Amino acid sequence: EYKQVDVGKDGMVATAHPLASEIGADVLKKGGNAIDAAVAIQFALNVTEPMMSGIGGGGFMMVYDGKTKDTTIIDSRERAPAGATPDMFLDENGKAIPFSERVTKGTAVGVPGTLKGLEEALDKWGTRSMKQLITPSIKLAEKGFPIDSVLAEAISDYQEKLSRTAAKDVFLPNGEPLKEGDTLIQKDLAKTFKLIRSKGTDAFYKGKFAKTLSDTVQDFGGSMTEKDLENYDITIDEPIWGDYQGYQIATTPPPSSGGIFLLQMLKILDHFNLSQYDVRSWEKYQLLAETMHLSYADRASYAGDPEFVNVPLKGLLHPDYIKERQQLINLDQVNKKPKAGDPWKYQEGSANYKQVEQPK
């Protein structure tokens, strides 16, 4: 069996799938570093947890370099194609296409970054080639593995959308979902990984795969071209740092909302000395809920890709701004109309965008 807590003297791996953790650990055991292991783990999870991540998507990889002592982020978040438009998720009446329908459309497909990110990570810090690191996943894709509970639940839940594409041949063989613990074989994906191993990431971003990917997006109504794939590159992002209870915290900046609002909620909540309240007390949950409403409101108003929009980071994290927000919170009463604050009173400039409420 496998453990959900472990200790070690010479390293550690934690992932959502035991086969991926085993592959990451083997890289470390064989003299690889944490970046080599992470790259191998991503390929492994692409195969063994296929609903959740892979070369069809994008991610944020934070790396502390033990040599240089620097922390940087490989940002492989997907890009909208050149043919994307502001109103592309609206119907003819200018109203939002229902989310459940929106999700299955070719217009939803971002230019994938994950593979470019892995290539970058290896360029920067790798001591094992992508050929070495992708090999365990080639074997898992080609030869198969028996499906875990979280996977078998996914296939059942999502049968409708899988049935309308090529995915049906993998996950719904003979027209029905695979069960626990049936064997999942991914021959085409294995072939793709082999192409990447032999040709490098051009097997993905150029040539016949790139043509097939873009034609398929277009078949499903999206605008992605081979040029969009050829143009794609990752971004190296500088972490945003905060102080909390004697710790320095390195977290992710825009185009992620996570770092700003993690720091903002910690700064708001730090004021309340939560440990004075029992960990299961209504007081604690109240303070958490009220803080979330305020921060999530600011997120909806002010966060986006910083290559494009002026995110008021200075204002949102200004200690006097934090003070204003905390003052809006009571134990005894709930804000029924929580709204974004005005971080612009605590920094220079103004938004190059409007305040537009999203439906639901």
Next chain:
Amino acid sequence: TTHFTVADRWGNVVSYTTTIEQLFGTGIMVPDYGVILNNELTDFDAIPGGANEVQPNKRPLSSMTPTILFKDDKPVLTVGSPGGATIISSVLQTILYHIEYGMELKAAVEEPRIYTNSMSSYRYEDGVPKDVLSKLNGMGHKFGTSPVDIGNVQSISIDHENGTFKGVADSSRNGAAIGINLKR
């Protein structure tokens, strides 16, 4: 989305969140190549004009929050999670329970979480007391009639004085933590 983390014997530390958006993304597979395509662009606002509107070549806002915490200029803890908009709250709660409440790491990860991004959207995990939910709803919150799992935190802590690592996987999935003890 999924989150994982690795630390090695040379002090390198990785905290990596990665996704195709929905479970199975769009559900579209590149024919003859087996690649499942993300629906990531639905993370943009459907109605344009604001910070997170769609533009060509723009990236949709993410809630992914891979994080590394430091003490005395060394990395001591990694945190991250999947779960869409709930991600920021799962990372927040893990740090609160481990640091503010001083709970051991596995316990901090397993502590029942809540999430709520507006007056009309609430989630809570099994273990949030029924009388707490009643008290909160009585003030105007809108927690529902059944719990849901929230997030999936993988985390590594590092003890630099003892020279040891500890890894934790969240019980919300079947993850595994594996320590390295080299024979050499």
